[PDB]
Amino acid sequence: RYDSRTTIFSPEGRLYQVEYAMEAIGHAGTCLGILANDGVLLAAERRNIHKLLDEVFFSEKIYKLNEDMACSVAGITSDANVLTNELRLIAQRYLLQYQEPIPCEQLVTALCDIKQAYTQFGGKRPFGVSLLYIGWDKHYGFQLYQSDPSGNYGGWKATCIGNNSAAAVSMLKQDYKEGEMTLKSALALAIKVLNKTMDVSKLSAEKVEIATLTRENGKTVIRVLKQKEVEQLIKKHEEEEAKAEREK
Amino acid sequence: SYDRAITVFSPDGHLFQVEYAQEAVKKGSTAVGVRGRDIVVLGVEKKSVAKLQDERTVRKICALDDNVCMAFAGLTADARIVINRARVECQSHRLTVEDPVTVEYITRYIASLKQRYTQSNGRRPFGISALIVGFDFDGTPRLYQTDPSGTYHAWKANAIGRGAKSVREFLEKNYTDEAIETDDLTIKLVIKALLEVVQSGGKNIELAVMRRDQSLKILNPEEIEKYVAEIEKEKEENE
Amino acid sequence: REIQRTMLELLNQLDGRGDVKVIMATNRIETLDPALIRPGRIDRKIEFPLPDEKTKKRIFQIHTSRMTLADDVTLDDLIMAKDDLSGADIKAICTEAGLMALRERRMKVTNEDFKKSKENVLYKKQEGT
Amino acid sequence: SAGFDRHITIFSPEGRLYQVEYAFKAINQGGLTSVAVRGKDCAVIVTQKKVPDKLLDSSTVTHLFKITENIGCVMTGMTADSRSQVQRARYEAANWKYKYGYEIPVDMLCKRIADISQVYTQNAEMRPLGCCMILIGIDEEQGPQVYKCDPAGYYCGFKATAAGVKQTESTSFLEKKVKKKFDWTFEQTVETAITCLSTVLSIDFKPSEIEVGVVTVENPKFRILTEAEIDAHLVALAE
Amino acid sequence: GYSFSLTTFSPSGKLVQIEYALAAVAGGAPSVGIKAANGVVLATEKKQKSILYDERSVHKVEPITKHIGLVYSGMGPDYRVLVHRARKLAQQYYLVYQEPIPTAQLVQRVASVMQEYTQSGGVRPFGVSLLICGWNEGRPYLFQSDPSGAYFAWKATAHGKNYVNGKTFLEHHYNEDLELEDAIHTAILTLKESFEGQMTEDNIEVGICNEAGFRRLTPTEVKDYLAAIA
Amino acid sequence: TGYDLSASTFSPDGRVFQVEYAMKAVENSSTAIGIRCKDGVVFGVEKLVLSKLYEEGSNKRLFNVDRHVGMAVAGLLADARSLADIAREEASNFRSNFGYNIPLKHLADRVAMYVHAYTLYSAVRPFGCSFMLGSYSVNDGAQLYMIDPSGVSYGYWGCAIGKARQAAKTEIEKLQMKEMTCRDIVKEVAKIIYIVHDEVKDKAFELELSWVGELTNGRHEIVPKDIREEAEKYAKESLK
Amino acid sequence: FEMARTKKACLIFFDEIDAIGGARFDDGAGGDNEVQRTMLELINQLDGFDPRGNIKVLMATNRPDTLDPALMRPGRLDRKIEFSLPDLEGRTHIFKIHARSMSVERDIRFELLARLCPNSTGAEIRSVCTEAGMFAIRARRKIATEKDFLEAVNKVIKSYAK
Amino acid sequence: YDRGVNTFSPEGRLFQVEYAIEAIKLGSTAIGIQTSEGVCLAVEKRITSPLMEPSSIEKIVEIDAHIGCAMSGLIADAKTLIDKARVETQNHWFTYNETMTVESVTQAVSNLALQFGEEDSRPFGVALLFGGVDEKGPQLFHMDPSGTFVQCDARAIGSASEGAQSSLQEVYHKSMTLKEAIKSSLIILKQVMEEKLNATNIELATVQPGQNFHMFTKEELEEVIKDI
Amino acid sequence: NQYDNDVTVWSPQGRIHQIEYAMEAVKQGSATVGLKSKTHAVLVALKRAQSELAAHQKKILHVDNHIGISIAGLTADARLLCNFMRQECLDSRFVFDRPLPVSRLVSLIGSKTQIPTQRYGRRPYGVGLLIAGYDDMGPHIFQTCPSANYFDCRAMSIGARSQSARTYLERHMSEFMECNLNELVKHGLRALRETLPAEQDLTTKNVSIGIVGKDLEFTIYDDDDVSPFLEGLEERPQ
């Protein structure tokens, strides 16, 4: 019964409350950053597709944290809402101090530090948010990162969190394109992964959110796709499978 | 009393809840460190990058200052927090204070920090042990073990993580009176100690060297094959 | 809380000597109270390391003695690299490989069966820090 | 069921009012009764001043508390919680005239008491004052107004109301009487209050066993009746 | 059992204490709100649980700004306290940022005020869920905010007692091309569906965000729909 | 029972048990009574003398450190010592802030405020003692109030607290407390204390008296009936 | 007691009398409650120096602090005795006793073995003597020796106290 | 029973302080001896691994030129108290412009230890011995974790504390020469620490009124290591 | 039993038994005594030994040139209270240059002893205090306990083996008041001799005394200063 409090050493030496924060993702909305180089993308599926949802958010899983960095979130909605704006506040503070855009890696580490601090102190709870990061910086350019509620982080070429992450990572191993990770090939991967990792059958594109980032015009750009173009992408997936049909 | 809380002694004087730090450290990565004839040499294993993963962000060893770094066995979030404390601490102390920073000073500071976080409720003491190696202590390099309990000590050669079990005997099995000569035998003994790692072939066995005067130098993949081959040839000729 | 009275009963049955010999065993020996593992009355402390290379050859061979091997898989790749696995993991590998060959109707076990057998089995242990 | 009510902050599985109703049961443990009525230009409060003992100075044993000369109050429940909350309302009115200056309506005063009680509820530090107030006052061209507040943070304006031991049955008698468009004159208001108490008290109305207060537009000074005046208004039912 | 704290996890990686506040919200009186081309309707059923209650004095529709309307389900005290806090936030935002607050920003910041209690064991959340409505740049807005600090955007929604019935009823009638008076008709229809017993305009209150501002409806104006409502 | 351990938790029914245990703590305490007179108040208090280690007189329970405030206490004595300072403060605070003596009702309010407030917070508990205010002022004559550690407080003609809280009522009601002078009320109080358990069980016993009125300039003096013993002999008159 | 008195007078002894002579525990509210039904039938039906028939009785336990005063008082107990870890003379004498318990090279410096033992028991002395037997067995030696005794003592002294 | 030190036992004892008393035993053996010739201290150096730096187990330490310390228990919490003892001498230097007596250092460390029950942190699992040649002569003092202190002509802490103490009571008096006190301490140490003596498992220091200097009597004490 | 916790909790009986646990913690062994006279006040506390090579522990402290105290246990709260009394006397000299009277000082100490007993986060005091003093009113003996009460006494004794001392003091309270300094200390030491164990007679090595009076500050006497007071002690008849 060593999970009864946040700050406890188990006889196994494991902190079961932080492990529970890890388990919390086991029912969160799925979001993936596909294998993308020369560009970078984040995509997600929507739980709340309903006949009366207004969707005036225009983004509820993808969140643009800076003019050239974006994030995708799975976990506690309120902790997500406060952390995604803590991101923007960190960017504003760093821009005010250094007069320079913040690097992606430093941002990831700084925010994971806050998450770790909340995991460390009693009378406090870890932020139940796991999330993926994309952006361009003077250090490396486009990057893809993953971060846990515990404050752990990792750099990735492709990753996915939330529901059905096993299938996503399996096909990422299967459809791996090491080096030739061009963004349009990542969209080709997306066309299939959106229908595959989603537990749905015959996916409707409106339950999907897609965004990307690229140095298209030199000053960096972040793009988000509407319903019609994602429907066209899913149609391209449908015709890919309808020509694989010749051997099904 | 029982292990339900840090701040109370067991009815025999034990601190089981604190003493869980041993297996807290043991389930992390694997690392080894030595001081050579002058140059300290460290090595890490157990990366196991899952294809799309990288070890670049994993950062088992980080150079705090041009004459001090450490190895971070344990949970990675606490390791990164220790990075941000120690690196900035030594940088600011050297940049502002009348005295320079030494590996002994940073080891003292980390020991005091962990002891102080043991000194209160509602504050989880850092669950990582670390080998902290420094090039400058009155100009002389040296090595330190540090533990979550706040205890710290100096070593000639040590191992942390899952490799902390066997190497304690292994070093005593082959440590010569001669401190491992130059960088040749220093790196050779690093490789010998890291041979307890999964395959010892250098496929996921990496290392770095600090020459007691210059900053941390990396045994990068374009060259670490040479040290791996040195270790393999040494183990093959003595068979 | 009868476990401690049973402990005193255990030390009574040990010492109170006779013909019956009494084996103790566990993986979690590092926790035991010296009142239980008292050297000077507890006679011997035997140890199994992780199965070494030659052990592992013998274990894979014995566990594969019943199924129809094929020369495309000399078990060496499954056996000699590292601190790989325990003997029970070896038995599980052999059983799952046999089942794997069964579902593909391959009543001649192959290298790929063992390969995906490892690929499935080795993920079934929990993480660390 | 049990356990989920040992602290005020805990919400029940159904999100029910466990500790709130515990405070109300504590109010009932203060075994007294009170009634209040509103009229065309008059409003009356009354409390069951059942003489505890002859040794108590009857003038001091009041449960009617003039908090501001235009504001009348009748209280039910815990004694010292009554004292504390009445003093808090006094301080709130004093601050209201200190900063805004203009008159504090009974509406706003009882609402402030109510959301202060809610602030009590939201924090594990503060036990809500286990007592209920009925406040009466004057507002612009609306005649007198009667409002009620209680540890739940509830806050409601009333044409009539009651509280205490006979709370349910007194309110039932009110709902039997006030449930009609009629000439609710001042004499009629005295009649309604005395009939409401007389249908629940079962003891004939001696001049010394209750406390009667009143606020009326014709004399906006809040009043508290004495024994002789109590009899001189009970004659309205002795007819 | 793990609901005794709000700052510790159940093994399921969940926080038990918050769904209890949501159950208290479900126990709250019904509220319903929809959008139409002219604006947004919010409405709530009110009861004289005792006939003693002053009917016209107390209300449940509350204006945060003259372009924002707000109704709730849940407990009254927490609701009023959070409404005062939301006003003291919204007018401050109007002052500091030199702009009447957008509805989405107001909803998000009230949700943050709600989230403030989702940590540490010394405080408890409000047991209230809010329907929020507004008019900005000629466009209507409707939102829901919840005790968890979460929020949603709905074209038509209802919560409180019989909330699923409200959902199904709105699905039975709602279209995005409604005109706001027929929107009032559907709102009073779902209000009448939600509550038991005879209903009149004094036992119902409604607030309307037109592009010409927000305002609460008068019982005189509610009588225009209380009669001839099907 | 059960929902008991904190004063900030209402019982499911009834009232706070953390306070009823202070109530029962008062039950074990030595008795103390207070009776008003025409121009002031008188208190009579009984107390043990432990054993011959005791210095024949010591650590009395009556106090007088104010111009007009007279006090008696019952219950746990140390809490009463810590509690009397609240009245000692409040009287001078009011007199300095507003230029005249505080009404005794407001004093009884604002002194018991702290006692009850220490029940509202789970961190603390109320004082385990009852106290007994008696004072005289120009605009309202002489008044007397009871305060119970639960915070229950009201005015009185005369009252009694301690291990004899109920019986002494019958002794109080036979005195014309509105008319009788404090000089004779002292003797009446002495004999009443003697009547109700003088030294029946706590045989190693001593008695102390109070005398506060305008003839004492409103101030409180611990009237020394060890000298001239007229109240002492008048109390001993009732033994047979 | 009845079957003992059917014997031609008998001596009966109880161990861990703390678990038997321990008093009532009401606040347990159940559990393994059989103790509360049985134990007084020892304590209250037990007889002492006066009310006792032709029977001799002896008690023992390592933990006396919890014992019921009824056991402590007469009618149950006629004397109480305390022990400690065997003193230096005691530890020497235990090895003197156990020199009979094996075949050894009987030139032993038991006087130094009892001092190499710090504060320690006498059951461990028996265990150490059998451990010197283990030393002979692992060496297959037909007799035990002083070195066997020394490192058998260190078996406890070092490994049980390192 | 024993969740916190806010309450005592139904006997009135704390269920914490005696826990520190046996926690004294988690460390190696340690001895302190006062003579008219000065004060000496000793601790068993028994290593975990000899390839650790052998001086890094700093259980025999100098506080200042006239004052030294020995510890029993964990080194971590001992470090704080030893640092307090060392820094108070420099505080005396910078405030009073002279040296500080071991008695007042003892008093200051006692008040620092006595904080966990009357703040508004936690008990220290270490017992300390100081030996000084201060303004009041030779002076050995002992603190247990309880925060109290006592003068001692000799004292024993750590593992095998009480046996060494009882055996030393046969061979001690208040005013012999410190050298024969060292010899009598060593003839008991040889049996108290493990089996045999050398730098891997023994350590000792001393200070004398004739030597306000170099308490670190190590590797020059070698002769009396081989005298026994 | 649940009700054995923080002084904030009352037991159902209406008691805080942890205060009684502190009081019984006070009663754990060798004797101490205090008693005063017309001329002087005296306290005595025997310095308990530890071994033949460890010093006896002093149990007597000086507060001011008219007041001192004596202490029972491991002095966790006792010595801190002594230092607070010393600072209070220093403040009295800072305000009016006067050594403040004993009783009015001890009243504030009693209030301070009561202060923790109402709130969480602070253990009750585990020591009992004896006080000997003289002032501009007279000489006094006071004593304070974990129950935060203060007592002016003709004689007092805390600890065990002291009920014989307490009875001797209860017998000779008839003399303690009128005695001089020497007679008073003789009476106290006779009460202490009443506490003698079976195998022992009083030794100088443990007896330690503190003394104050109308013409003498509070001072401390040991071994051969105690012996001029040990003379006149009760004999050993039967």
Residue numbers in the entry:
A (entry chain K): 4 to 251
B (entry chain L): 2 to 240
C (entry chain B): 303 to 318, 322 to 434
D (entry chain H): 6 to 244
E (entry chain J): 5 to 234
F (entry chain N): 5 to 244
G (entry chain A): 261 to 422
H (entry chain P): 8 to 127, 134 to 241
What did the article's authors report about this structure?
The following PSRpt6 state also showed two ATPs and four ADPs bound to the ATPase hexamer. During the transition from PSRpt3*, two hydrolysis event occurred, in Rpt5 and Rpt4, while Rpt3 and Rpt6 exchanged ADP for ATP. Interestingly, there are visible gaps at the ADP-bound subunit interfaces Rpt5–Rpt1, Rpt1–Rpt2 and Rpt2–Rpt6. Furthermore, Rpn1 is highly mobile, likely because its anchoring Rpt1 and Rpt2 subunits are at the staircase seam and simultaneously disengaged from the substrate. Because of these higher flexibilities in PSRpt6 and the consequently lower overall resolution for Rpt subunits even in the locally refined map, the nucleotide densities are more ambiguous, yet our nucleotide assignments are reasonable assumptions on the basis of the observed densities. For instance, in Rpt4, there is no clear density for Mg2+, γ-phosphate or the arginine fingers of the neighboring Rpt5 subunit, suggesting that Rpt4 is ADP bound, despite the nucleotide-binding DGF motif apparently being inserted. Either we cannot observe a bound ATP because of limited resolution or PSRpt6 represents a state immediately after ATP hydrolysis in Rpt4.
The 26S proteasome unfolds and degrades hundreds of proteins to maintain proteostasis, regulate cellular processes and generate peptides with second messenger functions. It consists of a 20S core particle (CP) capped by one or two 19S regulatory particles (RPs) that gate access to the CP proteolytic chamber. The redox-active thioredoxin (TRX)-like protein TXNL1 is expressed in many cell types and was proposed as a nearly stoichiometric component of the human 26S proteasome. It uses its C-terminal PITH (proteasome-interacting TRX) domain for binding, while potentially reducing disulfide bonds with its N-terminal TRX domain but how it binds and is regulated remained unclear.
